[PDB]
Design a protein around this ligand. Structure first.
Ligand code: NAG
Length: 347
C-alpha cells in the first residue's frame, strides 16, 4: 500500500530523472492537471508526463496521416501514369503501324498530329480548357471526337486532381496542433492513473473516446465533405467503361489494367471513408480508470464533430471557434466534389 515503487519503475523507463520521485505518497494539492489527492507524482513529474502524453498522441496522429497520405499518393501516381501511358501509347500505336497504311497524307501531317496529341496532353494536365481542323482543312464525325474526348479526359483529370485534393487536405489538416485543454485532458486520461496510485490500470474505452473526440472534433467536421468527395470519386469511375467509356475514348482518338486499378482504388477508398471519425475508436482499441479512480465510466460517448462537443465532460470545447484551416480544406473538398459531379453529369 502507498507504493511509489512501481511508479518509480515506470517513470524511469521514460528516460526521466529517478531523483525526482518520492519514496512515499505526498500531498497532491499542488497538482495542476490530475485531480487533487495523495500522489507519487510531483509537479515536474506531472509536467513531464503531460509532455510525454502529448508527444504520444501527436506521434500517433502523425503516423496515421503519413499512412493515409502515402496510400493516396501511390493511387494518384498510379492512375496519372496509367492515363499518360494510355495516350502516349495511342500515339505510339499511331507511329508504328500508320506510315504506309494512311499513305503519304500521314507522312506530311505527322508533325501536326504530334502537335494534336501534345495539345491533348495539355488538356489532360488542365493547362488549357479551351478547345486543328481549320489548319488541316486549309492545308488539305469530328464533333463526336470533340464530345467523347472531352467526356473522358475531364473525368480522368477530375479523378487524378481529386486524389491530389484529398492528399492536400490530409497533409494540411495534419499540421493543426492540439489545444492546451486537450493536452491536459490527455494527461488526465493516460498518466494520471500512475500518479493517483493505480499505474497498472487501463483507462475506460468511453472515457478515452470522449477525450479523443473532444480533441479531434474539428478534424471530425471534415467527415461529410470527405465522404462526399470519396463518393463522387467512386462515381466518376463508372464513366470509364463501355464503348463510350473513358479508357476506350482515350485509346480511340486516332480512329484490363485500369479495371484492376479501379477495383483496388475502390477498396482503399471504402477503407478510408471512415477516417476522420475513426481515430478515437482506433487509438482506444490499441475495472477501468475513469480519471477519478478505478471504476465504471458514467457518461455516454459524445457524438462526432465540433458542435457535439459543447457538453463534452472530459474536454471543454469552444464551438464558436472553428479551426480556420479545417474549414478551408472543407471548402476545397466541396469545390473538388462539385467539379467531379459536373464532370460526371455532362458539363
Ligand atoms: C509521353 O510522351 C511525351 C514525349 O515527349 C512526354 O510527355 C513523355 O516523355 C512521355 N512519357 C513519359 C511520362 O515519359
Amino acid at each position: 500500500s502507498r507504493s511509489c515503487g512501481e511508479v518509480r519503475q515506470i517513470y524511469g523507463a521514460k528516460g526521466f530523472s529517478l531523483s525526482d520521485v518520492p519514496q512515499a505518497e505526498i500531498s497532491g494539492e499542488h497538482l495542476r492537471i490530475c485531480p487533487q489527492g495523495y500522489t507519487c507524482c510531483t509537479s515536474e513529474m506531472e509536467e513531464n508526463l503531460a509532455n510525454r502524453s502529448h508527444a504520444e498522441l501527436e506521434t500517433a496522429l502523425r503516423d496515421s496521416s503519413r499512412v493515409l497520405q502515402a496510400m493516396l499518393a501511390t493511387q494518384l501516381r498510379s492512375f496519372d501514369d496509367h492515363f499518360q501511358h494510355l495516350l502516349n501509347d495511342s500515339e505510339r500505336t499511331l507511329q508504328a503501324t500508320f506510315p504506309g497504311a494512311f499513305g503519304e497524307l500521314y507522312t506530311q501531317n505527322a508533325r501536326a498530329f504530334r502537335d494534336l496529341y501534345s495539345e491533348l496532353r495539355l488538356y489532360y494536365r488542365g493547362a488549357n480548357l479551351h478547345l486543328f481542323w481549320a489548319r488541316l482543312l486549309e492545308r488539305l464525325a469530328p464533333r463526336e471526337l470533340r464530345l467523347r474526348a472531352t467526356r473522358a479526359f475531364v473525368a480522368a483529370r477530375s479523378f487524378v486532381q481529386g486524389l491530389g485534393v484529398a492528399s492536400d487536405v490530409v497533409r494540411k489538416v495534419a499540421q493543426v496542433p492540439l489545444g492546451p485543454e486537450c493536452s491536459r485532458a490527455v494527461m488526465k486520461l493516460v498518466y494520471c492513473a500512475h500518479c493517483l496510485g493505480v499505474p497498472g490500470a487501463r483507462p475506460c474505452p468511453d472515457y478515452c473516446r470522449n477525450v479523443l473526440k473532444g480533441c479531434l472534433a474539428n478534424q471530425a467536421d471534415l467527415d461529410a465533405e470527405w465522404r462526399n468527395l470519396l463518393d463522387s470519386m467512386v462515381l466518376i469511375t463508372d464513366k470509364f467503361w463501355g464503348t463510350s467509356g473513358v479508357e476506350s475514348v482515350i485509346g480511340s482518338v486516332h480512329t484490363g489494367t485500369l479495371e484492376k486499378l479501379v477495383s483496388e482504388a475502390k477498396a482503399q477508398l471504402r477503407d478510408v471513408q471512415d477516417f476522420w471519425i475513426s481515430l478515437p475508436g482506433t487509438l482506444c482499441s490499441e475495472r477501468c480508470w475513469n480519471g477519478m479512480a478505478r471504476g465504471r465510466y458514467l457518461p455516454e460517448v459524445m457524438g462526432d464533430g465540433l458542435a457535439n462537443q459543447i457538453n463534452n465532460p472530459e474536454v471543454e470545447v469552444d464551438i464558436t471557434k472553428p479551426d480556420m484551416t479545417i474549414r478551408q480544406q472543407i471548402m476545397q473538398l466541396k469545390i473538388m466534389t462539385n467539379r467531379l459531379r459536373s464532370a460526371y453529369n455532362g458539363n
